[PDB]
């Protein structure tokens, strides 16, 4: 008997209520407040140029057809009431394939205050496009966007605003980072306008600024490349009579550099330019190849000009270690400054 | 002023027969299509397909939906699209496709006072196209999207590109990492099946592959191994273990690259333009090891002739390979 009071209120509100018409149709612009709570910033995929994010996506607007007076100022109702009234048709402009979770029930809430204000939040897993400029890979940073607005209503009908000051209208949970090789420095919150073949629409934008962590690639690629270059220059110290021994040094290091060069683009998308890692491998290849060319020079002059052959070997013991050291000073200083 | 809109809309749907097309049993209904391409990605040779996201719009007049007294274009909730007649357009070469549904179904219905309906959907589709890889990786591809009506023939429906050559937009903003759209084209025609003749609209792109990736990954590793095998001609011919180790390693490595490259491609039965290079590079490193075997077999009885062969190979082998590069890179470009 006690809930029959709220049964009458809910039945009264929906009596003659048309959910096909936006609030204030033909009279004013429907203003929708929005904020996002990021529960977990998911992994970033360099191969697909995308990223995943889990959000509590909250929306709020005023509908005067849903004003009531009764025992409670706020009705915390079931989420199936959302399908009975008008809700904004918000979509993500750069979204790829998102999920509106409904386990064990549709993860939505709907709260109606006595003045008609509606609060309507839902839990989503958004997978959004994030184009990347991989010229400075693996020392690169990216600004991954997240844009959303109405799908059918132009800015003369529905507009979106941030609930609070824009910097504080997107909040990231402290423990939610699901990032492996990236670091979330911060996010910037903005608002735009798009003009399509159907009209002008308001777009709400967020940019997440991610900087990649180079630690994995130092172990996986840079350290093997450096040790291969050093390993090939050990051949300069073997005596000139070890022709089979110095050849095996030369060939096995060259073969190794080819394997490392091929294996270093497995994760990356197929791009037509050279990254910062491709320049390191190419130069390290030049040092390994030039150490074998030096041996063929020393081996060519043996038994004919022994004095010159010793001269070449003595200088290579200094020039090769010094040049490779200077190259690393220039390489790391050039890219770690940015 | 708002209860009048509800009264007007409820009057239209009252008695509305969704089972009947506009002008049923009369002149064909004309439907105009606009496409607003959002992104193209996942151009795969393994699966012989590509993925396309677009804003797909259809435009037609239904006299049963004409209203008066409201000087507005009624933009209704997308759930009203389940009560009106819409064309049964499908994509013939479509393997997988979905309409995005976050936060609601990405769908737009917008009526006009004269009865015109604008119906827009945001569609991601994985269309199919067969790629001729005989010139891979220096090849061009032509991947299309076919648009057709399933049930209604040309006696019932007509398709035209709304806006002529400007019907499809958004192509110039696409940046595929591995390709580049040379040109897009729009075609209108009729297709005859056993059950009748149906209209069709075809949208086609011409993609030209970028070779910059394959220089680093495939061509340069092959060229450097071939140069590596010419060091053997500057080593003394009595150093057998040294020159055999150099000759053997290059030959087996050259085989390894070719096998590795074929892993990530469809099991096509023809020879691609990259295989002719790898097979051509294999012959040079195989003739380099085959050359030493002749010197080693002959340098005992005729040591003078063995020295000459090593000195002539230092010129012929670099010259022949560069001549091979000249013929290869001029036939395929």
């Amino acid at each position, epitope marked *: 008997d006690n809930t029959t009071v709220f049964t009458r209120i809910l039945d009264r509100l929906l009596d003659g209520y048309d959910n096909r018409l936006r609030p204030g149709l033909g009279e004013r612009v429907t203003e929708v407040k929005t904020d996002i709570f990021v529960t977990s910033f998911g992994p970033v995929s360099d191969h697909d140029m995308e990223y995943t994010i889990d959000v509590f996506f909250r929306q709020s607007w005023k509908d005067e057809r849903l004003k009531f007076k009764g025992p409670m100022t706020v009705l915390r109702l079931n989420n199936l009431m959302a399908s009975k009234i008008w809700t904004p048709d918000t979509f993500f402009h750069n979204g790829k394939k998102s999920v509106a979770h409904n386990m064990t029930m549709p993860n939505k809430l709907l709260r109606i205050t006595e003045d008609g204000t509606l609060l309507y939040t839902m839990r989503l897993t958004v997978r959004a496009e994030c184009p990347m400029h991989l010229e400075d890979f693996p020392m690169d940073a990216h600004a991954c966007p997240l*844009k959303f607005g109405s799908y059918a209503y132009t800015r003369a009908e529905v507009v979106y605003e941030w609930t609070r000051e824009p910097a504080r209208s997107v909040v990231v949970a402290e423990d939610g980072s699901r990032l492996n090789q990236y670091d979330l420095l911060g996010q910037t919150v903005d608002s735009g306008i798009v003009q399509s073949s159907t009209g002008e629409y308001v777009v709400m934008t967020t940019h997440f600024h991610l900087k990649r962590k180079i630690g994995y690639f130092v172990i996986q690629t840079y350290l093997p490349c450096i040790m291969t270059v050093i390993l090939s220059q050990v051949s300069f110290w073997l005596n000139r009579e070890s022709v089979p021994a110095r050849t095996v040094f030369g060939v096995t290091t060259v073969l190794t550099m080819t394997t490392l060069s091929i294996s270093a683009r497995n994760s990356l998308p197929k791009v037509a330019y050279a990254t910062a890692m491709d320049w390191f491998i190419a130069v390290c290849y030049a040092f390994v190849f030039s150490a074998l060319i030096e041996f063929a020079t020393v081996n060519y002059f043996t038994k004919s000009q022994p004095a010159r052959a010793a001269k070449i070997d003595r200088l290579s013991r200094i020039a090769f270690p010094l040049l490779f050291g200077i190259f690393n000073l220039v390489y790391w200083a050039t890219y770690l400054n940015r | 002023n708002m209860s009048f809109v509800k009264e007007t809309v409820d009057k239209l749907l009252k008695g509305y027969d969704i089972r009947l097309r506009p002008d049923f049993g009369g002149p064909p209904v004309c439907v105009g299509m606009n496409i607003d391409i959002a992104s193209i990605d996942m151009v795969s040779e393994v699966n012989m397909d590509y993925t396309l996201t677009m804003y797909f719009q259809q435009y037609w007049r239904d006299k049963r939906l004409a209203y008066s007294g409201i000087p507005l274009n009624l933009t209704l909730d997308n759930r009203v699209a389940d009560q009106l007649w819409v064309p049964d357009t499908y994509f013939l070469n479509d393997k997988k496709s979905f309409v995005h549904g976050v936060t609601v179904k990405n769908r737009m219905i917008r009526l006009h006072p004269d009865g015109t309906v604008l119906y827009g959907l945001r569609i991601t589709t994985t269309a199919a196209c067969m790629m001729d890889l005989r010139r891979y990786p220096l090849d061009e591809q032509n991947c299309t999207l076919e648009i057709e009506s399933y049930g209604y023939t040309t006696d019932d429906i007509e398709f035209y590109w709304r806006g002529g050559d400007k019907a499809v937009t958004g192509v110039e903003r696409i940046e595929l990492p591995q390709f580049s759209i040379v040109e897009h084209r729009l075609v209108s025609r009729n297709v005859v099946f056993a059950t009748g003749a149906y209209p069709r609209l075809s949208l086609s792109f011409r993609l030209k592959r970028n070779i910059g990736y394959f220089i680093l990954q495939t061509y340069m590793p092959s060229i450097l191994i071939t140069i590596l095998s010419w060091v053997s001609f500057w080593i003394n011919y009595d150093a057998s273990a040294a020159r055999v180790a150099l000759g053997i390693t290059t030959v087996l490595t050259m085989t390894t690259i070719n096998t590795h490259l074929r892993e990530t491609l469809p099991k096509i039965p023809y020879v691609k333009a990259i295989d002719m290079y790898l097979m051509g590079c294999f012959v040079f490193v195989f003739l380099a090891l085959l050359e030493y075997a002749f010197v080693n077999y002959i340098f005992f009885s005729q040591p003078a002739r063995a020295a000459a062969i090593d000195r002539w190979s230092r010129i012929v082998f670099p010259f022949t390979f560069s001549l091979f590069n000249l013929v290869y890179w001029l036939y395929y470009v």
Partner: nanobody
Amino acid sequence: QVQLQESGGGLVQAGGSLRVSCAASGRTFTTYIMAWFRQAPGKEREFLAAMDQGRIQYYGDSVRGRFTISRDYAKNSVDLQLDGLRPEDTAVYYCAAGAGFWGLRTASSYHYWGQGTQVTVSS
């Protein structure tokens, strides 16, 4: 080399359209953000308008509703349309392009800059 060259501009009298155009060469900027900045003499370099690959338009508050930014992706150009100009709008206008790291409204996030065009409003 990558250069942003800016044409248009000039002198106008108390309002009136003055379209300013920027031509980019040496690199395809389809995936970048091309913006417009203004620097009045001695005040600061100020953000005016930007547009990214998805045709989204961003404007500064002082110029929102007056200046319209457009991009021509086939020609790798961005054009800004100045309307209702005022003597306060007399400055040098700069063309920029970047990836918008730490904010599309910050001049430190654009790695490519033009040389500027003089726009003088006489009234």
